Amino acid sequence: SELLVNTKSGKVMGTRVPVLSSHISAFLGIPFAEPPVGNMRFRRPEPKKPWSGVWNASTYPNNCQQYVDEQFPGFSGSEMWNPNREMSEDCLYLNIWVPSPRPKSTTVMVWIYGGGFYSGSSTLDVYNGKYLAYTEEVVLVSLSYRVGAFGFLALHGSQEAPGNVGLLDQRMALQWVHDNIQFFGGDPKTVTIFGESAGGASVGMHILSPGSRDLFRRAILQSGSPNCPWASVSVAEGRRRAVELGRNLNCNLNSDEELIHCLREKKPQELIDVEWNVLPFDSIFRFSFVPVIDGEFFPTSLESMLNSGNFKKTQILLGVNKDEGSFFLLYGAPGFSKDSESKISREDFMSGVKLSVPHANDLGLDAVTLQYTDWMDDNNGIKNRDGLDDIVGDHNVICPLMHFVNKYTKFGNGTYLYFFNHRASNLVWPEWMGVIHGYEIEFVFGLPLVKELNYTAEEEALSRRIMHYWATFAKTGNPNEPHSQESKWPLFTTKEQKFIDLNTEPMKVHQRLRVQMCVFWNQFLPKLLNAT
Amino acid sequence: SELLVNTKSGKVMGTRVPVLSSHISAFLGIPFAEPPVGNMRFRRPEPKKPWSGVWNASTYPNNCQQYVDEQFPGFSGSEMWNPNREMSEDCLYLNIWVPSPRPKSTTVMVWIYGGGFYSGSSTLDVYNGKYLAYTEEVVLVSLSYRVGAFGFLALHGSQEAPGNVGLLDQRMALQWVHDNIQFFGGDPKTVTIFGESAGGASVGMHILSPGSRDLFRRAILQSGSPNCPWASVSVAEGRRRAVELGRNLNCNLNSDEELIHCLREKKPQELIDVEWNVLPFDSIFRFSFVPVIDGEFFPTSLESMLNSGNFKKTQILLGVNKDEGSFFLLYGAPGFSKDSESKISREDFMSGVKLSVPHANDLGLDAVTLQYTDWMDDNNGIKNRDGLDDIVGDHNVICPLMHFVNKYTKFGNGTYLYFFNHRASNLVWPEWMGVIHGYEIEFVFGLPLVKELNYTAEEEALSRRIMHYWATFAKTGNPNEPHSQESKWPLFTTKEQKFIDLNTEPMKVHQRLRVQMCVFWNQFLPKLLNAT
Numbered sequence A, B: 001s002e003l004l005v006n007t008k009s010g011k012v013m014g015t016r017v018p019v020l021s022s023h024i025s026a027f028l029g030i031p032f033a034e035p036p037v038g039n040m041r042f043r044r045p046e047p048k049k050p051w052s053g054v055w056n057a058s059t060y061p062n063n064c065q066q067y068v069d070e071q072f073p074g075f076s077g078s079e080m081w082n083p084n085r086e087m088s089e090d091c092l093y094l095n096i097w098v099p100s101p102r103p104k105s106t107t108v109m110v111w112i113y114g115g116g117f118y119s120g121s122s123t124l125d126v127y128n129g130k131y132l133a134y135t136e137e138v139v140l141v142s143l144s145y146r147v148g149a150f151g152f153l154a155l156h157g158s159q160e161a162p163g164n165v166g167l168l169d170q171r172m173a174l175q176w177v178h179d180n181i182q183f184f185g186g187d188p189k190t191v192t193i194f195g196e197s198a199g200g201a202s203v204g205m206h207i208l209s210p211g212s213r214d215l216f217r218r219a220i221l222q223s224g225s226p227n228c229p230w231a232s233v234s235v236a237e238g239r240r241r242a243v244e245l246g247r248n249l250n251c252n253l254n255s256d257e258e259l260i261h262c263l264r265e266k267k268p269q270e271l272i273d274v275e276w277n278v279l280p281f282d283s284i285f286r287f288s289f290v291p292v293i294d295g296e297f298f299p300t301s302l303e304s305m306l307n308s309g310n311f312k313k314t315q316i317l318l319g320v321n322k323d324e325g326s327f328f329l330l331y332g333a334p335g336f337s338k339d340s341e342s343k344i345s346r347e348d349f350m351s352g353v354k355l356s357v358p359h360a361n362d363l364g365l366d367a368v369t370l371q372y373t374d375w376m377d378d379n380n381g382i383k384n385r386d387g388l389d390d391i392v393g394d395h396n397v398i399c400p401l402m403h404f405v406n407k408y409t410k411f412g413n414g415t416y417l418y419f420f421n422h423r424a425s426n427l428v429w430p431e432w433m434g435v436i437h438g439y440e441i442e443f444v445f446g447l448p449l450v451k452e453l454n455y456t457a458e459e460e461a462l463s464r465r466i467m468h469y470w471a472t473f474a475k476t477g478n479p480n481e482p483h484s485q486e487s488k489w490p491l492f493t494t495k496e497q498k499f500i501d502l503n504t505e506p507m508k509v510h511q512r513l514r515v516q517m518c519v520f521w522n523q524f525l526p527k528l529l530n531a532t
Ligand SMILES: *[C@@H]1O[C@H](CO)[C@@H](O[C@@H]2O[C@H](CO)[C@@H](O)[C@H](O)[C@H]2NC(C)=O)[C@H](O)[C@H]1NC(C)=O
Pocket: A412, A413, A414, A415, A491
């Protein structure tokens, strides 16, 4: 029957799921690794042992143990991102949505969730793959991976907690998809990996890591790139944070083994409770347990890999939202609140700047302030608020992405760049936050097609265009339908560096996305900080 | 008779001079110092010994020994600035234009010529004081002062060539005006000193120097300020240049006395011939022999004098032309020529930058380039040409003036700021050079009132308004006619920092002149260069 699928790990039984007046099949909660529990906490994942009998894949699995945002209880804006299932260290599962009738060999898209490497869930309502599977006739997978210390605690030199094990969870799910998706009707030769913020950085990281490159064909990076300043630390810095985590929990610190043993005795919540105490700076947009530049997953520095062409050469489609900073300013910067316009004084600006570039010396802070201050109007509360939004976005998201694009495009096989600047008409966050990171996701997954969710007609049409761009790209390496009548999203080339806006208005093509600021962030400021 | 004037130095006979259908008296070539010749070359000036008989003051005097621009022979644009009389070391004279009939006690304006401290003449057609004396009923004086090595060679510690003797020539003429102008009908209590580029810096310097402050009432600075980077050097740097000048002339360098004696044996042209060989850097807008920060004329650093209020507190009227850089780029920077549009390549830009900020290290050069490059359009030849014009102007003229204004205004008694941006319709220099430094002078002296000089009616009216602003300010401390109907030039205050445009269109008031760039040049760049 259409809902029974025999895989190399064993049989799986799915469930029939309604979607827009029709139905498809879903196989939810399929295990791809052994539970990383007990003495396997902090370890590389191990493949799931095959099972006898039929694995019930009718309901979502547990979400990984993680920090839960309780900043605005009952507010759907923040809560749409929290775990909606029980949390467990037994959380290495994937979900698959399959068109009905079962295809024979169709394009596969594997979603990798964001969450700063400290959070995220495959099971969120905004990541429900049925609309996209159904509408574009793809097989849609969502994986999971360990986050926080569970995923990224790094004691380089140890085999017990080497770092990067969350990235190895993701790799392992990609291995399973490679090995088994054919039985669901998917084409293992045509797997696009896609993700947002840490999900986008993650996609970049599998492009770079020799151990991951062969497990997929093509890649989509939403607001995230592997070289983002928040997305990796050195093995020395990872070590330092693991030790500080131990100190917060009164562990024996005399050796890696005693530390690791002490942390493995702790309930998951005891780690989460102190996780944010190990950051080296007073900062925003910095996360405690993230990928480490280990000499294995990543054989050299990300920048030397980029410069040298040491990465998978394929097609990529990528982009950023207009207001990537606003979330982190809201949560972490004085003067910004959810229910005011958040006009920012000059003194809250300066403070904002310091939180946003924690690694800068005073001269660096002056360079940033100068770059973003209109000195004819330097007490404009809105200019200050928006200027800081831009600083956080440009430094953390846009400019690293732009550097990745320009480096990748030299050796790669086709680049498509977007700038998503539509603010959804039903957004529950205040207006000042603008086009917030993550609010393109609902368009990518087709939520605007569901009448009850309160989008406009023009939002439905934007969602359909974006889904079709994404699936057509996954299918062919080009988001445009060949020889159709609609405006063409042009290739981004080294010479002309075109991109398009994504929104409800007629396509417009531009060039050199935020180039003036990205020269500052990618060339001038780093040179200043190295010299001084 | 109206043309005979008895002064404390002796009698003087002037000449009757036609001006716009009427006549006034001129007394030209009055000596105010002993000839600084022979063993008095490089010395402080000495007062002129009084004379028996009647001094013929019917013709212009000699111009001081100086570099003569021969870059464009026969071209009136460049030649209007060269000496139009014989050159001589016997050149310390002044000229006075007196209304007819002789006033009893009228406002006096004393003009101090520019020329980078290496050139200039009181006798140029563009400095003919008769139009202004006549039209505004002031007594107009033009002085002279030693330029080049003759004026500014500095061997601090020696009494034979101590530095600043050109500034002492100017002081001495101001002393003579204080002591004698009453006999010409002038009011020694109401002397405004005014000047352009090095003339404007000079005015600033008498405002600052305790030894000069008492000799005048009020001051006008056209495109020049005492803190300009080109307008002074340290005693160490002056010493270094004097020694290098000696080396170029095969002098004995064993002591100050032997050097000074060797230089005093040289014909004036032998000094001029090697004067430009002593500059420390490959540069533009840098002159070899300029004022020195000696601990006497200037008791401390110009910046400490500014910060502390150690200066004369009076009213000042000052301003800049729109395109202050274009002359020096034309003369000294690759890619700029007089008979082309001078579209500048990226590589000539970078070179331009290096010539313009010679004292900068590489990081400083990158900061300047970034500030002035539009990275969406970085190969635009016109943007590059104009961007460099702005760099040279802002760094050398506008931004130093703006710093002076803001410092002065804290302690002073009334500041009026202008931005002259009218390009004269008969300008012989190419269009790309725009509103070139020095081309407001002809408006200040009333040349547009002379039909044969080919100005428009609206240029005649701009000249009359400017002359009347200048004379009304000299007379009262405020350029506006009290209780008249015309738009009011407002005071520049610390809080609101207003200025006006000077041109043929209705007055417009603005605020914070080039503030974005002057924060870069006055605060950020110096901080960068000190740290790195
Ligand atoms: C992506 O890859 C293919 C080749 O691997 C490129 O197409 C080749 O283009 C070269 C250069 O014109 C031709 O000699 C070959 O005929 C092409 N080969 C094939 C198999 O078509 C294609 O240009 C690349 N696209 C981009 C944007 O780099």
